[PDB]
């Protein structure tokens, strides 16, 4: 059994199972967009864990939210819990890539009682925003929701056109294919990227600056973090200064933001810092 | 001859109730009342003052609206967004918000948030929401987390008797007799052991984020639109030096008023004093 | 002194519908349903002179202020029996009589000779049996019901700029003017042109399966209790001769009155000949 | 290169889940599931059936499928119109049905009222559902609204064990290889172990039965050809008033050995199954 619902009161959510049930809990949390498959290569080559991949709520198999309901980083985070309550877990580990690395230090943040280490890919705070710009965000926001269901959902008559699209959106031929798999959804033109409208809204309120320093300092279990070379440090060098002032273990490794995926050179480079960190 | 009163009005994710006041062809006005109350918190306010097409609405999870569907949330800028909807669903372009206490926080929120859609502010003794800073954040919003988790427990208390009903909405002075008996009015629902306040067990949650105190300070200064806020002299906010500080420094017009904090629904002289403040300030 | 409630909600586990309660908290429990399209206020005339009872004035599904089913629910006549049922669970009552309408009487018949030892008695208002469907035009039937569905998306619901305009499309579904006003209070929603009937467009689906002739009669015959039946000169007996005869193999009570369909709601002399009947009735 | 097995279908009103078999440019086919299964249910037979694009479908309130929304019924026609609607997402204007048991009631209802869509059945121990007469229909209609009551207090069972949750499964006849297939689509993590993911009102009765003389009707409407295996000793196969009907029938019967579940408790039965409809699906 790889592969189940979990019901929450609130929501269906879809879930692939690796390794072995006596194995050390891990849930394992993907990127905007992605899903579950983005642990294609990297669940199977750390045995030892009992890592459950989530669809986060709107991606890959999980149900879509129902109406009214928001797609907040809070809200993961949410779900998280519940899944793992749903599971019959206290303590639990977390392995998360790009959003679901934030969302995970959200919740570790929040909940250090319940998160046993962080393993993170490639991510670490969300896009912050000030006070003097909130009441202005929100005005974003408020329009952004008039014009919901006027939202474009894109079709690709061939399935090769539906790979390629992500492509340009960058990752590997097979990191694209590999999404694809529990990523597309066939319509009657052909398949199309399954996600919810509303998970390209504006957020009305971001966590402020302080918001995001007081969470990653809030955290006190290990974490052990890989930054792609070819990744989120080469798009926010103000980072490299706010990564010396914590003491979360940084493994530099090449490869793009989605290393882990790309390549079986990229996860084995990832599955090796990641197998050392949980077994001490 | 005709005249319709009462309506449900359909946005796209819930379906609101709300009790239509005045002439068809007034300045427009949506109405918000405050938490746990509903539309009747303006039934002798709202009469009143005539010259004015007044949508008192219910909020979600009050009164005669819907609750919101599995897994939202109850957030002050989710109302926000509700209201906006309601003036969609209703062909409004500009139109004004009379607000008492959380209503008129949403208000504030919005006018700061949309400064080119509200004409005017009419504020019942509200302003700034309670604020918390980032350095509690995280453990609020474990607060938040575990709240949640707990939500499956709550429940609601049941009145055998409808006196017994009104009696716990007073619970020596805060409101009176007559304000509770018209939102009980709106606001109860049948059961089996009798009658219940009807509610939504969600709005006890706790915020996952409040607004920071600069954040509230932001929205209120960018409220472009005049405001006229009356503030009750037995409630709280008249008595804040903190709230007299931050008036001092922004343009809305103050009135205080003899009263408790539902001083425009415990009794008609109530109503009426607020109603001489907006009814001028609406005639400009 | 104490004021009264008269309009709530009642919270069903699948759906919460809207009721408008009319006379004596210890009055005899009765439940009021309407016709297809109409709401509660169809019996705005009658419930006020049946001074003995407690009639709960009930919004169907998809009515009134009722809220719509959710996402892939049928509108089919029993469907309406169960929410009638737990409505009755729902206010603690045990066993209980009907007070139906047009539709609303249909499935006041269905529901007694379902479950009769909980129908103390039923007052009819010109309706008995549904429309029927032999099983030689079912596979047709549903047939054209699964097409209906697929093209369910394209639905619209005409708007009305005019208040006035609405009411005299009401009165072209035959009906008295104030009568169409009378259910326009209870039936309009505001939208961006103005007002719409506020229905559900799955209301226009045909049946997938409509019941037998056998099955009417069969629904007919099981009933138990005591039944007040009223038929309008210009109702349903003009309409189906056929139903004459039926009815005198029926142990039904049966008061011929003049007026159309909506005799009890037209005007005030249907009302109070509707009135006079089903007082007595229920005073047995 | 890697091909998408495993799909999410989106209705207008719910969302269901299938596994995708077979050519993408195949004879199309929409595989139907019996009550209480899953589109595991098809892991043996779809593969053997190479000419065919075989989209083998979690009905509404099973295997992976969403639950209808609150107060929305399991009848046999909301299974039919979810069918008809997955044939619409999917492009498909006429296209074929395999269906197991009530997935061949479902199967029959849909060719009966639609035979310009349906072009072969092809149905594996089921034709059509239990009936009954308008005689007692009040009874059963007061019987149907009584368990609506009463279905707030049941509770589903909970396996601490993985294989007692399996065991279960076996509680008609089916074999152990049978029911792990459809354990691993239909079981569900709970607190405290396992349970079969399944929606409660799934065990309702009907409101309103199909008479004797509607279920002759809707196969007597079946325009297309059908292929219809029945198990040699099931109750299809051999009361007398099933094969009374069946000889007056154009439907082509073949009996094989094997129980209801004769195409998914073994390969030899699967085979079997697979012979029959490849040949069926050839002409």
């Known amino acids: 059994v790889e592969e189940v619902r979990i019901s929450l009161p609130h929501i269906e959510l879809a879930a692939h199972l690796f390794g072995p049930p006596d194995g050390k809990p891990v849930i394992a949390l993907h990127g905007w967009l992605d899903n579950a498959m983005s642990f294609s290569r990297l669940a199977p080559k750390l045995a030892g864990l009992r890592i459950v991949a989530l669809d986060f709520a709107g991606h890959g198999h999980s149900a879509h939210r129902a109406e009214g309901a928001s797609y907040l980083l809070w809200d993961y985070a949410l779900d998280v819990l519940m899944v793992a309550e749903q599971l019959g877990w206290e303590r639990f580990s977390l392995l998360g890539h790009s959003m679901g690395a934030i969302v995970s230090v959200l919740l570790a943040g929040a909940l250090?009682?319940?998160?046993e280490r962080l393993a993170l890919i490639d991510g670490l705070?969300?896009?912050?925003?000030?006070?003097?710009?909130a009441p202005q965000k929100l005005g974003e926001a408020l329009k952004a929701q008039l014009a919901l269901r006027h939202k474009r959902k894109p079709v690709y008559a061939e399935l090769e056109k539906a790979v390629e699209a992500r492509m340009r959106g960058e990752?590997?031929?097979?990191?694209?294919?590999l999404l694809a798999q529990r990523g597309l959804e066939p319509v009657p033109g052909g398949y199309t990227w399954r996600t919810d409208a509303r998970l390209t809204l504006p957020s009305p309120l971001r966590l402020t600056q302080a918001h995001a320093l007081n969470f990653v300092r809030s955290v006190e279990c290990p974490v052990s973090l890989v930054l792609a070379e070819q990744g989120m440090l080469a798009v926010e060098p103000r980072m490299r200064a706010l990564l010396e002032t914590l003491p979360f273990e940084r493994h530099h490794?090449?490869?793009?933001?989605?290393?882990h995926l790309d390549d079986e050179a990229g996860a084995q480079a990832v599955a090796r810092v990641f197998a050392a960190f949980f077994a001490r």
């Open 125 to 133: 705070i969300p896009y912050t925003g000030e006070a003097d710009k």
């Open 253 to 259: 490794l090449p490869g793009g933001h989605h290393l």
């Open 171 to 177: 990752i590997s031929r097979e990191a694209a294919e």
């Open 112 to 115: 250090p009682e319940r998160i």
